[PDB]
Ligand binder design. Structure first.
Ligand SMILES: COc1cccc(CN(CCN(CC(=O)O)Cc2ccccc2SC)CC(=O)O)c1O
Ligand SMILES: [Cl-]
Ligand SMILES: [Cl-]
Ligand SMILES: [Cl-]
Ligand SMILES: [Fe+3]
Length: 498
């Protein structure tokens, strides 16, 4: 049928517990579960499950007036008690949500009536509404589907208020969603969506070519980029490449030799020809990045000075810091110690491996010996959390996370950014200012704090920005134009109209 589509994802969507993370997939949680307020491309939120709201003068007490016509997909009512119970269930697992500062800011949540929901905060937390709008954890499952009045230990059926319902799941095979015929809002034109589980990018491309699937939708890893380019010229297909959504970069460990030295990090930031990397490894499909955040990101248009590709300058910086070349050797030494840096990445990720090889080659040209450490995903994440890396591939989070939530998370010791920044003398000052910028409502001070944080991170060369990457699409032409969601990690299936 023309109102049924088949697409793909590298893994299953997961159990669709609205309040937990891996192996739950965010786009799928957002298909079934809904927020109080909904994020818009212009950075604002609109009323959603909450039709209106007010707050006290000190900005600590918030009162939401909820819709009274919304039902969970199983018929049960959505009301303020249901919402309040969801906030309780999330915060009963509060430690797990440390990365998201709203989870530490919420003091109290209670239903004042069927339609009035009161939320109290520790402080006037300015990104309050934006974080309520995220795919997780603050979305709502039917309280009847709690397990012993909790969700942190599992749920029963994944019953949301959203436009899609999970029909069935087969582990390592597929997931099937259908349209919610009792949805409170606009009904999707598509009636059924099947997700084929296809972990390999080449196999996803082949699946599209043979006609097994109708739609591919994802970031730069969706399919081989040379294949994507070929597809974009093939009149039998339709392809799309969005405007950039987030940054891909290296994080450099300021607490580990030799990346503990500023001169070394500065030299590394001059050593990479990013334009050539992109044209060589990314088939020319992405944009060069000079800064942690693109100048188009809120609060990030700061006139930060780019470190352009300049091997001569990279060498000079290293020479001045005492890293010089021994007779008949291409790798620099200082105090007998070679300039050796470990670059860790997911070993089975062909794109990461390709970029890593380019980075290694470019840095060898200025006398730095980069050793490639390709490992399984679990081992790489363990390295991120504990700072067992010299350089590591990393990325920002896209809207609405960038920049406030990404910066917020830099304070959390179990994250790559904290670890990479751990060796900076100004790290406590940075973490203090990150705390302040989230709670300030002096707009002038807020901009000044973002400027100081991002400028320190830039001047200290904590990162090696590589690319601003885009969303891409491959689809059967009959599906028409495929729209993008304001939230970079969501997929607007309900907006597709064949
Ligand atoms: C595509 O994945 C993301 C897209 C945009 C933002 C994030 C950041 N996540 C931050 C929290 N995760 C950790 C991380 O991505 O660094 C998930 C998480 C939270 C608490 C405990 C464990 C984990 S997975 C290690 C948001 C989320 O997953 O809901 C993403 O992981
Ligand atoms: Cl989890
Ligand atoms: Cl995952
Ligand atoms: Cl139970
Ligand atoms: Fe995450």
């Amino acid at each position: 049928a023309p109102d049924e589509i088949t697409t793909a994802w590298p893994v299953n969507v997961g159990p669709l517990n609205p309040h937990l993370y891996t192996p739950n997939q965010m786009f799928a949680q957002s298909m079934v579960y809904e927020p109080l307020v909904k994020y818009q491309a212009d950075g604002s939120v609109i009323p959603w499950l909450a039709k209106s709201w007010t707050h006290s003068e000190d900005g600590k007490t918030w009162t939401f007036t909820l819709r009274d016509d919304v039902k969970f997909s199983n018929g049960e009512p959505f009301d303020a008690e249901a919402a309040a119970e969801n906030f309780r269930a999330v915060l009963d697992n509060r430690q797990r949500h440390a990365w998201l500062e709203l989870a530490n800011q919420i003091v109290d949540v209670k239903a004042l009536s069927k339609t009035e929901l009161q939320i109290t905060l520790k402080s006037a937390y300015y990104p309050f509404l934006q974080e309520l709008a995220l795919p997780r954890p603050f979305r709502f499952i039917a309280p009847s589907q709690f397990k012993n009045h909790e969700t942190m230990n599992g749920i029963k059926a994944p019953i949301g208020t959203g436009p899609w319902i999970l029909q069935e799941s087969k582990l390592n095979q597929y997931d099937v969603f259908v349209r919610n015929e009792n949805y409170w809002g606009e009904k999707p034109a598509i009636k059924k969506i099947t997700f084929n589980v296809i972990p390999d990018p080449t196999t996803r491309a082949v699946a599209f070519e043979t006609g097994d699937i109708d739609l591919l939708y994802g970031n730069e890893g969706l399919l081989p980029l040379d294949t994507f380019a070929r597809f974009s010229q093939n009149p039998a297909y339709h392809t799309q490449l969005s405007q950039p959504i987030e940054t891909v970069m290296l994080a450099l460990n300021t607490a580990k030799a030799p990346t503990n030295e500023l001169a070394v990090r500065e030299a590394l930031n001059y050593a990479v020809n990013k334009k050539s990397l992109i044209d060589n490894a990314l088939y020319g499909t992405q944009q060069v990045a000079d800064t942690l955040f693109a100048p188009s990101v809120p609060y990030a248009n700061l006139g930060l000075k780019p470190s352009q590709y300049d091997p001569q300058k990279a060498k000079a910086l290293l020479e001045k810091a005492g890293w010089t070349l021994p007779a008949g050797k291409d790798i620099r030494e200082k105090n007998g110690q070679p300039l050796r840096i470990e670059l860790s990445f997911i070993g089975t990720d062909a794109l990461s491996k390709s970029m890593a090889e380019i980075i290694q080659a470019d840095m060898r040209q200025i006398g730095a010996d980069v050793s490639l450490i390709g490992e399984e995903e679990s081992s790489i994440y363990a390295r991120q959390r504990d700072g067992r890396f010299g350089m590591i591939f990393h990325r920002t989070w896209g809207a609405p996370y960038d920049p406030h939530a990404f910066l917020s998370s830099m304070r959390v010791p179990s994250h790559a950014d904290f670890q990479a920044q751990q060796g900076l003398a100004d790290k406590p000052l940075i973490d203090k200012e990150i705390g302040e910028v989230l709670a300030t409502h002096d707009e002038t001070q807020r901009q000044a704090l973002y400027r100081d944080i991002l400028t320190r991170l830039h001047d200290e060369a904590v990162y090696l920005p590589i690319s601003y990457i885009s969303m891409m699409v491959v689809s059967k032409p009959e599906l028409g134009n495929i729209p993008y969601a304001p939230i970079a990690t969501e997929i607007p299936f309900e907006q597709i109209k064949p």
